[PDB]
Fold this protein.
Amino acid sequence: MFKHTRKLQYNAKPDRSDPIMARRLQESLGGQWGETTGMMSYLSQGWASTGAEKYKDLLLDTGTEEMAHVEMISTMIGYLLEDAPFGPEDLKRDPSLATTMAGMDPEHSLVHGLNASLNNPNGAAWNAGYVTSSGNLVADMRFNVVRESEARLQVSRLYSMTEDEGVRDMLKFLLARETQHQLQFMKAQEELEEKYGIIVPGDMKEIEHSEFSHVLMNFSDGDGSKAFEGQVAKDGEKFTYQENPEAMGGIPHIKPGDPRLHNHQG
Amino acid sequence: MFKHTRKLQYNAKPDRSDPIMARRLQESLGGQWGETTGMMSYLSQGWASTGAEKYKDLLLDTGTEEMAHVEMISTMIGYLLEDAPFGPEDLKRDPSLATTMAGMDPEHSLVHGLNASLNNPNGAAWNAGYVTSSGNLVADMRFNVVRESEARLQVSRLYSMTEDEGVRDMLKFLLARETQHQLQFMKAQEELEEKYGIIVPGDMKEIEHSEFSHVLMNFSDGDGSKAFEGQVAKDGEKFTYQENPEAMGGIPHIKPGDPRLHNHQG
Amino acid sequence: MFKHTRKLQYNAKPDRSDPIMARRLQESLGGQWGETTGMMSYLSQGWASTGAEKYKDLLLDTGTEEMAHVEMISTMIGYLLEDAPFGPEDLKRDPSLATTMAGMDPEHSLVHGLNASLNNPNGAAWNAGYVTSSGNLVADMRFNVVRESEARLQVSRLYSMTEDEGVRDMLKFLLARETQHQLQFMKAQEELEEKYGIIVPGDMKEIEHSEFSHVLMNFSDGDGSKAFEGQVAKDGEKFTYQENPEAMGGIPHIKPGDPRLHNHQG
Amino acid sequence: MFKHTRKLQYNAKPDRSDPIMARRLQESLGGQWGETTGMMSYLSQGWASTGAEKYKDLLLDTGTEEMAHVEMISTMIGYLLEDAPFGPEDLKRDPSLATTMAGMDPEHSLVHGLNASLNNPNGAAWNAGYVTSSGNLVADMRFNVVRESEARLQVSRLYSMTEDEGVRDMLKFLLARETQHQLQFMKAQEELEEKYGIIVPGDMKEIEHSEFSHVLMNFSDGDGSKAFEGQVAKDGEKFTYQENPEAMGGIPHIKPGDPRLHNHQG
Amino acid sequence: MFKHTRKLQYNAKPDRSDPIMARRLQESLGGQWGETTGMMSYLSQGWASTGAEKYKDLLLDTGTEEMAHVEMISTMIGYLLEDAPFGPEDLKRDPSLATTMAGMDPEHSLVHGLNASLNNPNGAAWNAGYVTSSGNLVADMRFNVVRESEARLQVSRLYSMTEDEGVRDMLKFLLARETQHQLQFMKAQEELEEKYGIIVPGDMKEIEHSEFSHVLMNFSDGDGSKAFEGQVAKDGEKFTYQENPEAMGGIPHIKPGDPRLHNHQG
Amino acid sequence: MFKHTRKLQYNAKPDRSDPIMARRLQESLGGQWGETTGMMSYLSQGWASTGAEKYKDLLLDTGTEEMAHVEMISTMIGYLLEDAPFGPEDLKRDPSLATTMAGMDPEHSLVHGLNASLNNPNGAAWNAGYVTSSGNLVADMRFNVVRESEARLQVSRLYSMTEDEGVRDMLKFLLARETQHQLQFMKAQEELEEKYGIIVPGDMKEIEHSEFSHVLMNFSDGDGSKAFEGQVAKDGEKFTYQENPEAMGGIPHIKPGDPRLHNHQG
Ligand SMILES: [Ca+2]
Ligand SMILES: [Ca+2]
Ligand SMILES: [Ca+2]
Ligand SMILES: [Ca+2]
Ligand SMILES: [Ca+2]
Ligand SMILES: [Ca+2]
Ligand SMILES: [Mn+3]
Ligand SMILES: [Mn+3]
Ligand SMILES: [Mn+3]
Ligand SMILES: [Mn+3]
Ligand SMILES: [Mn+3]
Ligand SMILES: [Mn+3]
Ligand SMILES: [Mn+3]
Ligand SMILES: [Mn+3]
Ligand SMILES: [Mn+3]
Ligand SMILES: [Mn+3]
Ligand SMILES: [Mn+3]
Ligand SMILES: [Mn+3]
Ligand SMILES: [O-]
Ligand SMILES: [O-]
Ligand SMILES: [O-]
Ligand SMILES: [O-]
Ligand SMILES: [O-]
Ligand SMILES: [O-]
Ligand SMILES: [O-]
Ligand SMILES: [O-]
Ligand SMILES: [O-]
Ligand SMILES: [O-]
Ligand SMILES: [O-]
Ligand SMILES: [O-]
């Protein structure tokens, strides 16, 4: 079960309004790698774990924190949309506002009454296909490192897309939390790799066709990847290199379908 | 530019038909973490790189290889759909085929003429939201390790979802290529982390609020995550632990919108 | 069956072109709460009814009217796109059109030849997930009141987003029809609630855990909702209030899955 | 900010596993009118309100409660998926499981390791297009009554889709909470209608073309809707009736576009 | 404007129920190439035309007819869902219904109350990305031929997916109407090609690099396409053939981005 | 299997940067009728063909060529995005850039680091619903002609949306390839229509209700379509014309559902 306090985890108030920045911050709210993705991924993984409490609890702790970040980004967008221009009265007050209006999300005013959406900057709805919860935490802790990496890259970019020190104060807090999250998820990843194996899943080495498992195959005519040849991979075995990969599988010849399908193919 | 040969990279022919397995393999063709996601992600990242040839060429090599895997999965699905039941004549021939029909994708017959789709097992279209190309290869090589990890987990599951030795032969090849891809992307990741930093992006340490960068925050009442307290994180600094995270940001109070919005909120 | 006349239900011609307003009006054509949603919802519900003709016919009457509104919005958008700028020759004519171009939907010209799309202002395709037809008209008449409420709110906003008297004339007609539709659907709602009950569905009172049916639970630390305590609800029973909701269900513990799933969770 | 406890709001454990029922309950987790829709809609509306605390707090209270229901449905699905069949070893063990496998979501095993998804029963991803937050609480409290109405209808149907008394115990609780939520949102609706008006938005009566605001228009040739003629609408005015609605707007004639568009239309 | 009659264009009643066939027919209602796609495409194109009345009227005539077909398919699905099994009480009166339940769309009962959806057989929502209206009727009449071709192929397949003579009677009518629609759209296509040219658009021959306009390029190593060499194309010019197409464009080298983007690429 | 060369099929470098043109070109990369649609459609159809090598090889040759075009469009977008404005420091340098920034896709910088996406100009993700592969090549060759027609229309429009002669040189090449592809697919279409029939599928004439197969039905009150009356259709039979189409199928009445569904409809 959850409980809520009205106080934000950390400040989320800009020094001044900016509806263009509000639109950019929709990426962190409703985007592919944003806070809603983190919230739903970590809570899903946490609820689905039957394993060690160390990781189950880490996931539920962090998913719950991400809900605080969803709240912060939402709040920041709302403050940034204060007094935003949306019609002829605004243009009569200051005709230069036409440029601002051109760059805004039309739906911020029309659909939401100058409030945040749960979409990205381009109005694409957040959706569950952005979420990963596979049942395997070696894989999913790697996913979580990536989620925080892609997110922290975006927050870093956002920092250079505003000069508002109130906006930047919030971003500086989020950058630091994303450092913590990257590090905690890397530690879990490394512990799980030691337990189960460096390759996911770790119990398939006998089954796989091992002769192809350490061969770098040169399918594009640049030769840059040849630098991996002879380097030692993380499992202790060296990469070999094939300059001219071979097509070993034959020519497909599937049986034509039943006439009731009307597969007229010449 | 690309060129094509009709020969497959490796065998993709089952010993017998199985339209239920064909539906499962749609995950590997049109699903979230499948071969189309790999193909499009690696090609995109490769095209978008202005950096080291070692990595640009690796990405183009591997993206091109994934096109061969898309071709293999497509081919295997087509063979597995041979003679699949789709109407009353088939049920008259063998009434037990009703169970098979109930588990099939209705669109395999109706839309595609007993051929593969570019959807997942549930008919959800493959879409570009599954693809990541960010401009930062520290982040994206981590993504690529995840893509191969989630994929190889699924391929491993598929191995236990059939007893067909022809299907399994293909899967054994793919498992091995996914081991190679996991390892080559991990090596690139490790080199890029040494160059740029273990936190992504590596050039924001002074900007972030460092006091919060190594604190584990206990938001869920389980205590499993306390086991991280005092462990040395990958950047050389120990994690600290906060039993009772504090709401530091105040209660938001956003300004009411202009009357032309009709924001009647009480 | 349907028949069509080329004459519009009501005027849908603007005094002047304005491709920014055209983009806004895509909300009314292809958006979440727009006229296509109304058309498809009311027709679907009407076709699905096996009940009283008073309501079945109301739904078919109104769904058919909404088709006329779809036609009007489409027509208005096409007029509004007349002479819209789309390339260098327009900027040679009037360099000040750059601002207009920046705010336009790029697809209006490129994809549609300066004609309406079936997308919202952000290019998101209209989709059937916007439509409700459940089989229960107590629920669905409430939905229809909502549909007309959200739509009329948007139409009201649009009125303040232009000074064009021809656009406003059309909007004044739609506002009036939306008043009628809100009222007719509220009357149906109330008649259906008298027949079946104020709670949907009205035949589950013995089954539900009545102990929890009138309790306001305080999950967020604001105390504003305590004002509802002791007020009489629409069914004649007073609300009680719980300042500290209890977690009554225990800590879940699901069985670890079969090893064929490779659920490595620590 | 939020905090989490591992204890569930109410019991969410079935007496027996049933992966077909797990698939149905995906509607309540990831579907159009499910608990994620409630959670995100009420939180969004609550965060976006600058108005009376009575309603802002009610929304945040209830949105936070819905997160507990998301957790319960997720948990129930996980328990229901225990020991679910997914490959040849299960059919070797008990060939009668083929019917169960045919009805399952293939991704429950393959993607999630016999855990819940954030999709509906058909694998369609939950998405933000299911959420409404408009800025007007007269409209949105009506939406919330609908959300709880469509949901409680689905929960009622689910009750008749299982004989498991453990599942039914959870459903009986949810039915009761949905009664409370319907009633509280109706009370807010009633207060807001008394304040602002029965038509949403309530400040446009002078602007609309009033001559069309109370006319029932007969567009479908059934006569059932004539029963509304002469009835008093909720705003105190009687409905009139038009047996033959007229097309008042003329035949549109839009200007042909610039030749650079290549609009070759004959 | 539109008007509606309760009488269907043609019979749409099955001899007996069949919820599996109901699910198949969702392709014709909510699928990619189904009746909703035809309705919305032809109406959109018709509204958007400023050209010859012969074609504008044909489009509006046919789009309006397709609305009747939407109505018929919806009706047929509702009849086919009569008495469909959905819970434990159905299996008790007849246990052989288990296979039927396994093959049904779970949402037909749960969401819609045993009524049609606006989704395809897999639950994927109909969406406007299935619709084409480009402004060029040489292109769009070709699209319309295709829409009727793909649809009639599906109807033909459906004919072999049931033995119900009432279902078949409806399909025999639709097959005939799709013959008419293919033929009328082909006639329009041919007239428009005579007026504007066989290549769309017909006014770019001077602009294009003509040396590449009639060359078959052999990118896949099969030699089957060599059979086109020397054949006369529809514009009166012979195809030539290139066995080894050449990469003529150089190796791209794009400029690295500004450091504020953090594009760390090695 | 595939192989890649770093050299482009044809030049794809602009004379100057232009991030607005970059956004337009996203239509050709990630849009409905763009190069990814062609690539995936032709490869899918080619892999799925069991018929004549002339057409199977044509499809694989062309699908492979379209991969080169995807690469070209990607490259062109990346060059066009060089030095694009994205933050306050750019506006300090030149305040005039505000108009450019307003028209840009915010995700080009924020998500991709000033690189191409796999979305259309509005940020809508490319998806597999844009792809057709049906099993019948009479239908699908028609689709392919359409694909190349809609695409060449868009490329022709793009030609009038820039004055950059480097962009135009690329477009001139693509126009010529689209002429070739339109012609080769029309030739295949013609040959297949001679073999199987002018109506798709060509083996249903006895089954369909022939009396309705050549009747133009006047559902919209314009009279333009009467011009088809008496013209000879492509199968050699004349069209007839029905001024007042009749509703022949009666008024349906579906049985009310079981009470367990709670279908309260009045
Ligand atoms: Ca290489
Ligand atoms: Ca904890
Ligand atoms: Ca409270
Ligand atoms: Ca009527
Ligand atoms: Ca060839
Ligand atoms: Ca006509
Ligand atoms: Mn965060
Ligand atoms: Mn985080
Ligand atoms: Mn692969
Ligand atoms: Mn791989
Ligand atoms: Mn309307
Ligand atoms: Mn209305
Ligand atoms: Mn609930
Ligand atoms: Mn509720
Ligand atoms: Mn039709
Ligand atoms: Mn038709
Ligand atoms: Mn091309
Ligand atoms: Mn082409
Ligand atoms: O975070
Ligand atoms: O985060
Ligand atoms: O791979
Ligand atoms: O892969
Ligand atoms: O309306
Ligand atoms: O409406
Ligand atoms: O609830
Ligand atoms: O709920
Ligand atoms: O049709
Ligand atoms: O049709
Ligand atoms: O092309
Ligand atoms: O193309």
Q: What stands out?
A: The beta strands of chain A are 2-4, 215-217, 240-242. Chain A touches chain E at residues 153, 156-157, 160, 260-262 (CB under 8 Å). The pocket of calcium ion (ligand 3) is lined by residues C 218, 220, 222-223, 225; D 57, 61 (CB under 6 Å). DSSP finds eight helices and three strands in chain A.
